[PDB]
């Protein structure tokens, strides 16, 4: 990835082997958790499309998920070309390159072309666009890897409220929906699926009670 | 923005003059990068020390066969051959630098510098650059060629590289 | 490997022991799977032919694969020497003699000569050529390690569709026969070998079906 | 095929449907026999490569033979390319370019280019070269379709000399060998494989007896 | 179909009856086989869309195949209308307006308009476009009339290698999935499905073996 170099002139610095090893280890140890998306977004800050292609090729296993990621990248490139076609217009006095769906995906774009598109003024946000595409793909993958539906989350007879709410919020974060749907679900589904012993306790507190009040109520 | 490369031409080792070319990388980018990179020699192989093997007075000077030195060879920086990038630019006059080929999608490293308007070539050879400085050096070169192309003296690219 | 300085010039640098350790560890732990070529290309960016001969000789075990790679490098060097004969006689003062195939390999040349080739004007990319040759050899090696053929894939009555498609795409990436042939295979052989129930569930969606709906059909 | 048109100007005349029907009939009844090569050469006099491709595509069945013919055409094209190199460069306005090895087989050569190569002065014998290639292929195929070898031809005890010599000469014509070898083959095999009585009858005539005397010997 | 005259110009000509008779006879007698497309392309060279609609409507029987061809022509016409939109504004004096997707088929246009379209300056090849569409439809028809798939081919213990390779190449030319995939299939599936004795005889020659030696090995 390119980085601000002293002084004020961005030059290309190849991806460090330690970053690739950290990525391989986090994909090996954590599989495909919701948190990987932030770890991926933070490990590849300002990365050229070639670096993101390297980081997606260095993965070991989960080839089905990588295939969905590649297909969604292709779909985003296709839609991007459809949303950004060259309509006839007077030619600009200044010419700057332009990134195609295939030029953004780093397939047919040489490293020099990407460095140009990034360091030129005004900059072309090819890296951020490809990162948005990969993040959409990773969201698809982590929502697919969900073992059970959020509607099936129910507490055991003696399962403490601690592990119950932990697993429930984990599955809810892995689940995909708008924020208002989650706001309705945390009020309609959480208290209902609890164990009756502590369900009575949560009902005694009130419907609009916060999480900490219920958690300290059923505490112990 | 568009690269500029030069060629110091030699006729049997006597220095003759410098031709410099503006490559239209803003319309034919992959074609222009291949001539640029072969001129610098940065990929290991290139034009330096190759000759113009076919010079036809009033038509064009052709060169660029650095592997076989007679029009049967040459290779690109993408492999031996690549596609015709596009045909936006046309053969409008002397000084136009266009790609030689052996039919469509067979571009390698051979190029030709036109010394006349050759509209019949339009749509069949990709144009990707034009002489900037040195056209009378290209014109003087014509005298060492013939109707069929055979040249009388060895005409070489003594040195070449990128200027800007 | 060469590294640029503050003013922009580059000079030889000793190979880091961390790079060698990581390369040997990934070769030992991950054996010879499709994800060694990207990591190899990332580890040795700008490495001299001596550094690549180091990274190859240092691989203990799997000596048959290393012999295959050596034979491939030998054939590539012979073809390079045949396609680019070297000139004889005195060499110009401002130019260093061009390397032969056995010298492009770095077998019969000193490190200083490699550095002079790599930092010449214009620079000569011996490292990139030898890296391309090693990558081709590694592609042939990962082709050889391929456990099964692409046609013999048939899903068991109990083997889930996820494991089936994982194995399929694994051996498909290990095949690397071509790109359009791979595209035709993922259309035909993927749906041709499904379990009858999920098979007809996929046929219900027709050939226009994508992989995501292909999986969520048999899912649950 | 092109034909001399009044007056003295050759123009392109498409292949007639009756010629194609005659070819399909002769490749339906005669199938593959020694007589097909002469019939093919007469049905396609002065045919453009497109006409010969049309006449080779219309054959229904015998796909192995057509594949042999296509492969031998490819081999002859490769040999023509290795013997007649084609120089790249802009063409002269008056004369046409030298046809490559695949421009003869009508694969990548448009009909106009072939018409030019044939009607130009001096003419380029593309049609005759492609006909020689197809004739080599047909010779290969008819020598393959031979049921038995020439060494296995033997006369039955009461099988008349007529059928024996007919079958022997038919197999000898279908067989492929130089005419000089055939001159010894006939004088060594014709009399030896005959019936014992007719064997002595022919040996009574002499070793260098002609075919008509040998025939009228055992006539009836 | 149009025909050139002595002066060089072309004009409409009534369709010859023994062309319609030959087409109907070859369609019925040979039914549908890969060798009906070359015959169709040769019979109707330069035919107007009315002549092609004649040659299609005249085919009695196999009405399902003709309906498939009509549907394919229908979809192709719609794509042509979508790809190019008629321009607005004043039209040049030396130019006049073009046909629509449905009028390329000749369904809603008179013969004089077809002749004017075909002999305009510059000429518009409506006949060649509709012939390409009909050839694609006939390819799909001969694909449907294929009696097996390419993978199910397995030579019997007694079925000779000649019949096996004939059936293989027949259903391969009837497959037409691609051209490079065909090149991979003829290397792999051809060698993978032989009878064990002749199978190992072919394996004795390695993958470098060509078809001629491939067959003369199992021959005799």
From Swiss-Prot, chains A, C, D, E:
Chain residue ranges for the region called Interaction with human PPIA/CYPA and NUP153: 57-95
Superkingdom per UniProt: Viruses
Residues at the site labelled Cis/trans isomerization of proline peptide bond: 89-90
PTM remark: Phosphorylated possibly by host MAPK1; this phosphorylation is necessary for Pin1-mediated virion uncoating.
Subcellular location: Virion
Function noted in UniProt: Forms the conical core that encapsulates the genomic RNA-nucleocapsid complex in the virion. Most core are conical, with only 7% tubular. The core is constituted by capsid protein hexamer subunits. The core is disassembled soon after virion entry. Host restriction factors such as TRIM5-alpha or TRIMCyp bind retroviral capsids and cause premature capsid disassembly, leading to blocks in reverse transcription. Capsid restriction by TRIM5 is one of the factors which restricts HIV-1 to the human species. Host PIN1 apparently facilitates the virion uncoating.
Name of the protein described by the UniProt record: Capsid protein p24
UniProt source species: Human immunodeficiency virus type 1 group M subtype B (isolate LW123)
Lineage, broadest ranks: Viruses, Riboviria, Pararnavirae, Artverviricota, Revtraviricetes
Residues of the whole record sequence present: 133 to 352 of 1435
UniProtKB/Swiss-Prot annotation, chain B:
Reaction(s) this enzyme catalyzes, per UniProt: [protein]-peptidylproline (omega=180) = [protein]-peptidylproline (omega=0)
Mutagenesis / variant outcome for changing residue 112 to A: Reduced ability to stimulate MAPK/ERK phosphorylation
Top EC class, one word: isomerase
Subcellular localization, as worded in the UniProt entry: Cytoplasm; Secreted; Nucleus
Domain (PPIase cyclophilin-type) ranges: 6-162
PTM annotation: Acetylation at Lys-124 markedly inhibits catalysis of cis to trans isomerization and stabilizes cis rather than trans forms of the HIV-1 capsid. PPIA acetylation also antagonizes the immunosuppressive effects of cyclosporine by inhibiting the sequential steps of cyclosporine binding and calcineurin inhibition. Acetylation at Lys-124 favors its interaction with TARDBP.
UniProt-annotated glycosylation sites, renumbered to this chain: 107
Record-listed cross-link Glycyl lysine isopeptide (Lys-Gly) (interchain with G-Cter in ubiquitin), residues: 27
Main location group: cytoplasm
N-acetylvaline PTM sites in chain numbering: 1
Cellular component per GO, a single term: vesicle
Modified residues (Phosphoserine): 76
Complexes and interactors: Interacts with protein phosphatase PPP3CA/calcineurin A. Interacts with PRPF19 isoform 2 (via N-terminus). Interacts with isoform 2 of BSG/CD147. Interacts with FOXO1; the interaction promotes FOXO1 dephosphorylation, nuclear accumulation and transcriptional activity. Interacts with integrin ITGA2B:ITGB3; the interaction is ROS and peptidyl-prolyl cis-trans isomerase (PPIase) activity-dependent and is increased in the presence of thrombin. Interacts with MAP3K5.
Function, in words: Catalyzes the cis-trans isomerization of proline imidic peptide bonds in oligopeptides. Exerts a strong chemotactic effect on leukocytes partly through activation of one of its membrane receptors BSG/CD147, initiating a signaling cascade that culminates in MAPK/ERK activation. Activates endothelial cells (ECs) in a pro-inflammatory manner by stimulating activation of NF-kappa-B and ERK, JNK and p38 MAP-kinases and by inducing expression of adhesion molecules including SELE and VCAM1. (Microbial infection) May act as a mediator between human SARS coronavirus nucleoprotein and BSG/CD147 in the process of invasion of host cells by the virus.
Name of the protein described by the UniProt record: Peptidyl-prolyl cis-trans isomerase A
Gene that this polypeptide is encoded by: PPIA
């Amino acid at each position: 990835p390119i980085v601000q170099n002293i002084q004020g002139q961005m030059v290309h610095q190849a991806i460090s082997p330690r970053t690739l090893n950290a990525w391989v280890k986090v994909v090996e140890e954590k599989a495909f958790s919701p948190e990987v998306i932030p770890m991926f977004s933070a490990l590849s800050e300002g990365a050229t499309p070639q670096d993101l292609n390297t980081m997606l090729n260095t993965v070991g296993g989960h080839q089905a998920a990588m295939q969905m990621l590649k297909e969604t990248i292709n779909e985003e490139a296709a839609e991007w070309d459809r949303v950004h076609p060259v309509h006839a217009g007077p030619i600009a006095p200044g010419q700057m390159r332009e990134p195609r769906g295939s030029d953004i995906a780093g397939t047919t774009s040489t490293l020099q072309e990407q460095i140009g598109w990034m360091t030129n003024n005004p900059p072309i946000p090819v890296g951020e666009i490809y990162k948005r595409w990969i993040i959409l793909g990773l969201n698809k993958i982590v929502r697919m890897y969900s073992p059970t539906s959020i509607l099936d989350i129910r507490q055991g007879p003696k399962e403490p409220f601690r592990d119950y709410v932990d697993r429930f919020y984990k599955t809810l974060r892995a689940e995909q929906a708008s924020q208002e749907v989650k706001n309705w679900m945390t009020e309609t589904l959480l208290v209902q699926n609890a164990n009756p012993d502590c369900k009575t306790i949560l009902k005694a507190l009130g419907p609009a009670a916060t999480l900490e009040e219920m958690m300290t109520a059923c505490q112990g | 923005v568009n690269p500029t490369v030069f060629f110091d031409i030699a006729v049997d080792g006597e220095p003759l003059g410098r031709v410099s070319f503006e490559l239209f990388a803003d319309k034919v980018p992959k074609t222009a990068e291949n001539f640029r990179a072969l001129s610098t020699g940065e990929k290991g192989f290139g034009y330096k020390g190759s000759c113009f093997h076919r010079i036809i007075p009033g038509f064009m000077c052709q060169g660029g066969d650095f592997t076989r030195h007679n029009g049967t060879g040459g290779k690109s920086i993408y492999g031996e051959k690549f596609e015709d990038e596009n045909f936006i630019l046309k053969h409008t006059g002397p000084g136009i630098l266009s790609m030689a080929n052996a039919g469509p999608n067979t571009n390698g490293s051979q190029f030709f510098i036109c010394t006349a308007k050759t509209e019949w070539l339009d749509g069949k050879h990709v144009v990707f650059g034009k002489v900037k400085e040195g056209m009378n050096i290209v014109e003087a070169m014509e005298r060492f060629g013939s109707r069929n192309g055979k040249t009388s003296k060895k005409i070489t690219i003594a040195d070449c590289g990128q200027l800007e």
